[PDB]
Amino acid sequence: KAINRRGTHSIKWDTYKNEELIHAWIADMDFEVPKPIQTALKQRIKHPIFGYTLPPENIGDIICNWKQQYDWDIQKEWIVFSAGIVPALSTSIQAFTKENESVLVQPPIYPPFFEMVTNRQLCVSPLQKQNDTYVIDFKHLEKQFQQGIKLMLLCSPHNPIGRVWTKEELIKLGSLCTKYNVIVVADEIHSDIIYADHTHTPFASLSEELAERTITCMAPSKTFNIAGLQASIIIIPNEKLRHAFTAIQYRQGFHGLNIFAYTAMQSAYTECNDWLNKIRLYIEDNAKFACEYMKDHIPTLSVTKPEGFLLWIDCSALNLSQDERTKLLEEKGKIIVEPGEKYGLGGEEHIRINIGCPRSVLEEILNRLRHTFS
Amino acid sequence: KAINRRGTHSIKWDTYKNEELIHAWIADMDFEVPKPIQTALKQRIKHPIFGYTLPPENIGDIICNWTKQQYDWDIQKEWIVFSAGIVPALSTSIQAFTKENESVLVQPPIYPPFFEMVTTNNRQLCVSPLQKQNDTYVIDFKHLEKQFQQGIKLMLLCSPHNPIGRVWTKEELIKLGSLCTKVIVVADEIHSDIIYADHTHTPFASLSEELAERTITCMAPSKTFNIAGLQASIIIIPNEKLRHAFTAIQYRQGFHGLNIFAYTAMQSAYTECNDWLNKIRLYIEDNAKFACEYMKDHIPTLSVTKPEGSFLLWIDCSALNLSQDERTKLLEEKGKIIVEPGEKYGLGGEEHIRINIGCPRSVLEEILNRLRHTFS
């Protein structure tokens, strides 16, 4: 069921008012949230007082149990609260680097990684496009660490290309972080949408030593489409780094999350297991359906196959500018996507689309892509 | 009617496990939130998607309307900045408008986050302590002017003043702006809407175009309507150059606006709940009257200064000549009540306590029976 999202103050569906537009840019799904979550949220409103709230007594076990998803054994003492992964990227920047020290990213990558480093020096190690996918340039990556890299921002799974890194990839990158003592911030916000042939490998799960150097940021906000509820869990095994993170959160006046962030994250992590099994097969089939429609009906585009709900498509054979592509997609396509040039080196002449939609919606998303470039 | 708040993850009621305790320490009310907030929140959940949301289309008019209807403050839509709470906004203000180890001034006895945010951000804590006279507080303007001569860059002002409850007159704020004009001002007006019949909240940036371009004004419905767990706050900054450097700091720390229900509750709070706020003012003041007399009549060994707004009561316990732990233990052991210690508010908080009178009179009379009982 396509659900009307116009008139809901949703950034995706309400920022543009021309009702002819199809929106597939912002990375939230157009699906009903799991009912267990909604039942807890309407249950909580039955108490008409919204004063200051504590984190629940049980919240530590629930998250430690959610080993159920990745067989990582954590302790309750590691969990830190954040209103979103973006503040935790900034706090991890300001905690573990000095001003004018460098921070490394692997484009094409989520732009906030670029903007938050507004605070530090840009170092890049763009990934290499191989075999209809992306791979890390480990020789070049270590060529950057030989210059003094202090922090690395890892995306796993990697937006926008959709890479779910293997254990061997992380180890050999882990082998370089140990060897050069690079601190790692692991933005694993998509850790819960993984396809049938892949398995998410938490970076700190690999080792006792990589655990003491990695800050792992997770949330149900993207997985369960509750990104307006602002729940995030940051796991820091190293006690000495955890306190410097929490100092950078305390002197900014952050004192924990709001009533609905606590309530939703508790239900999402306890009672929503079967809905997440469903959404994985619907999303994976939406990626499969889309990758063939580009074979049959748009042979001038190259789509990088994801392994974990965003689709990364090469539009380089078209020889179009971003201004040429954007205007065309809006005028005849009547569809709003993300321009890829803002993803950095390797995002040029690409677009990113949201496949977290009903297949009915996905067909018009592709029908208008064909019309645009036919 | 007292409403059960035990087992709700309330900091007030669930931090202590002794079920015999009566709690009046933290500054949230035990009152039903206005029903139109409950209706706005239940209306939103009928839409089962909580993705990323924009601030509402009308919220700028409502905010502009609210500040003119309550304070006759004509503001423009470009001045409104959103914050998840005033403690982040105080911290944001310290970071935008000072450099490290520069001086920021506060007036104790005052909200402790004014102490903690200044020092944790490696700025110099400067004070200009308030002076107790005739069971109210007045500013030591001679002392205040002395500290400004040392190069003070910032001042964090509380209006009205937690914990004492002072609602500054226009003459005082006129006199205080005159010294700031001879200092950047952060105005923590989170209590701006609970004011008693004989008093009027005087916005500092309302006084003049001269004080507007040097003042950052923090306001919220969180304390007024008891929705402080939803984290809605409104920052007004008329000076363009000051607004952008504040929003710059928010951006570098990943803030992109508030949560779905903070907008949803705040939008209703400023539109359809006006009569509920008339109710709560008259209930609070008579609760402040009832309390101030019971300690007049039946606890004559305590002197409480009369508040002119909000719902906190500032009470001196020095005639008892007890240390804080001497005093605290008696309240938790013998009183079976948790109140706010004063010593953590700074100079002039020694041997005082702060109690919450935002409760039904039923609770309020038992709160006082035990406070007498505690020290009899």
Ligand SMILES: C=CC[S@](=O)C[C@H](N)C(=O)O
């Ligand atoms: C002991 C709690 C610290 S305090 O009660 C926090 C609240 N905003 C207030 O103004 O009181």
